Structure formats: structure tokens, C-alpha cells
Amino acid sequence: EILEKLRSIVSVGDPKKKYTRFEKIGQGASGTVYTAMDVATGQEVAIKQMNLQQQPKKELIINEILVMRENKNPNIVNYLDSYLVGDELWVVMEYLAGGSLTDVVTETCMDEGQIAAVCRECLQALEFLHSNQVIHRNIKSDNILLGMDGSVKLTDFGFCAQITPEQSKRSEMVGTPYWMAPEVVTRKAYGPKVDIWSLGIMAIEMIEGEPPYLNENPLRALYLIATNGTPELQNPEKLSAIFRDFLNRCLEMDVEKRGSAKELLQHQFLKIAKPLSSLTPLIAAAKEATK
Numbered sequence: 385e386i387l388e389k390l391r392s393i394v395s396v397g398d399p400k401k402k403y404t405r406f407e408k409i410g411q412g413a414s415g416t417v418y419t420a421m422d423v424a425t426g427q428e429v430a431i432k433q434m435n436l437q438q439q440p441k442k443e444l445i446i447n448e449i450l451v452m453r454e455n456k457n458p459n460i461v462n463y464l465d466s467y468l469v470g471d472e473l474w475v476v477m478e479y480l481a482g483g484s485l486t487d488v489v490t491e492t493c494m495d496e497g498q499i500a501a502v503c504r505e506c507l508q509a510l511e512f513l514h515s516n517q518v519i520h521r522n523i524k525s526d527n528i529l530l531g532m533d534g535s536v537k538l539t540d541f542g543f544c545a546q547i548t549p550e551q552s553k554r555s556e557m558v559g560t561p562y563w564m565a566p567e568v569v570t571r572k573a574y575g576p577k578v579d580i581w582s583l584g585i586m587a588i589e590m591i592e593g594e595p596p597y598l599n600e601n602p603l604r605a606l607y608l609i610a611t612n613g614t615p616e617l618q619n620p621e622k623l624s625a626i627f628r629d630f631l632n633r634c635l636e637m638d639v640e641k642r643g644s645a646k647e648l649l650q651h652q653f654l655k656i657a658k659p660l661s662s663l664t665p666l667i668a669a670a671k672e673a674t675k
């Protein structure tokens with residue numbers, strides 16, 4: 385009954401009177417997401433509402449709130465507060481007007497400059513987390529949020545892990561199959577570089593619209609990751625050499641040879657990044673496409 389630890393972390397007081405103008409903007413396995421407005425303050429917020437029954441290990445909920453409140457950063461969606469509403473947990477975060485990267489990758493064609501701009505900002509989030517001994521473990525386009533200024537922010541700490549010098553590696557088979565690094569899929573001990581792999585897969589989303597093997601069922605994709613290793617692009621000839629190089633460094637099978645987030649921030653690919661204002665036309669296109 386670590387529900388007591390969860391009960392001591394959360395704020396008390398009715399969120400249903402602190403916040404108004406509730407609108408469902410999202411579903412998800414982890415719960416439903418609503419927008420709302422702080423009754424007093426006017427601030428727009430996103431609230432994730434999670435059924436405590438839905439989650440069998442309430443230990444992960446605790447971990448999610450702590451990591452988020454302890455690791456604030458400009459490239460991470462800001463945690464504001466949390467509340468228990470009966471058997472439902474509400475997490476309140478800053479609302480980022482814009483959209484999901486998923487909408488952009490499925491509905492637009494991104495140029496290398498735009499892709500490099502997104503990758504740089506995500507690598508900055510990862511550098512910060514990994515330096516704070518946190519592995520995200522669920523990097524994908526669905527967890528990247530884009531601001532109306534082209535701000536890029538990472539969210540979702542539902543699956544993350546804290547490591548320590550004593551225990552530098554994890555062994556849970558956690559993530560979303562198509563984005564999971566081979567060492568994770570094959571139950572080897574793994575470290576922060578699983579996030580770099582997932583980032584590589586997200587770069588393939590930005591190129592091709594989908595992670596490798598998405599037409600296949602999840603179990604089949606796990607088999608394909610275990611057997612193929614480094615995925616191949618549909619049309620690699622369409623990419624610059626330096627982009628292909630960046631991809632190769634993100635998607636190295638040899639963990640020790642795979643780029644760290646720090647190493648990758650100095651890659652040549654990132655030097656072609658467009659300014660973040662370059663992403664706002666993608667956001668406009670995606671909103672129009674998903675009317």
C-alpha cells in the first residue's frame with residue numbers, strides 16, 4: 385500500500401473548482417487528456433486523468449510525478465500539480481498550443497533543416513535527462529509537442545527509469561514496440577542510449593511518415609527488430625550523406641558505438657538546422673489536414 389506515498393505527494397483541493405472549461409483533446413493507454421483553464425489565473429492547462437485501476441503497479445505513477453517535478457527544463461512539458469480524484473489521478477501540466485509531432489509527420493513532408501531542428505531540441509531534452517540519471521524509454525513523435533512559436537517539448541514520464549552509479553542499467557521490457565531498441569527487445573541490460581535509438585526511429589518517422597514495420601502487428605515488429613537490427617530506409621538515396629551519417633550513429637547496434645546525446649548534439653547534421661520558426665508552417669499544415 386504505497387498508495388499512502390502517492391496520497392502524500394499530491395495536492396489536496398478540488399481540481400474541479402480550480403480549473404474550468406474542460407475539453408477532451410486526447411485519449412491514450414495511460415489515460416484521457418483534457419484542456420482547461422485555471423479559474424483564478426486564466427492559464428491554459430492540460431490535465432491527464434489516469435484511472436488507478438488501469439495501472440497495476442502504482443509505483444510507476446509515483447515515479448512519474450517525482451521525475452517530472454524534479455526535472456524541469458525548457459524542452460520538457462512543465463509539470464504544474466497533481467490531485468487524486470477518487471480512484472483517478474489528475475496530473476496538470478502547461479498547455480502547449482500547437483500540435484503533436486505525429487500530426488506533422490503523418491500529414492506533411494519535412495525538409496532536412498526542419499528535421500535537424502526537431503532532433504536538436506529533443507537531443508537537448510535527452511542530454512538534460514540522461515545527465516540527471518533518467519531514461520525516458522518511450523521516445524516517439526507522439527510524445528513530442530510543438531509550440532505555436534515552434535517550441536519543441538518532450539512529454540510522458542509514465543515509463544521512465546531512474547538509474548544510479550550502483551544500478552546503471554535496467555532490464556524491464558518497456559516502451560512502444562516499433563520504437564524500442566534491440567537491447568530492450570532482447571532483454572539485455574540497457575542504459576540511456578535506448579533513448580537515442582528511439583530518437584533515430586523518430587527521425588525515420590519524420591522522413592517516411594512511420595517507424596519501420598508499422599504495417600505489421602506489434603509482436604511481429606518485435607521479432608523484426610530482434611532479427612534485423614539497424615532498420616533500412618525505403619529510399620536512402622533521398623537523404624544527404626550527413627543525415628544518413630546521423631541516422632547511422634543513432635541506430636548503431638553496438639551500444640558503446642551508438643552516440644550519446646552529448647556527442648550527437650555536436651553532429652554536423654544539426655548545423656543545417658533551420659530556426660524553430662520554420663516549424664510553424666508544418667503546424668498550420670497539420671491543423672488544416674486534420675480539420
Ligand SMILES: N[C@H]1CC[C@@H](CNc2nccc(Nc3ncc(C4CC4)s3)n2)C[C@@H]1c1cccc(Cl)c1
Nearest residue numbers: 410412414415430477478479480482483484539540
Ligand atoms: N497522445 C498525445 C497526443 C498529443 C497531445 C494531446 N493533443 C494536443 N493537441 C494539441 C495541443 C496539445 N498540447 C499539449 N500541451 C501539453 C500537453 C500535455 C501532455 C498533456 S498536450 N496537445 C498529448 C497526448 C499524450 C501525451 C502524453 C500522454 C498521453 Cl496519455 C497522451
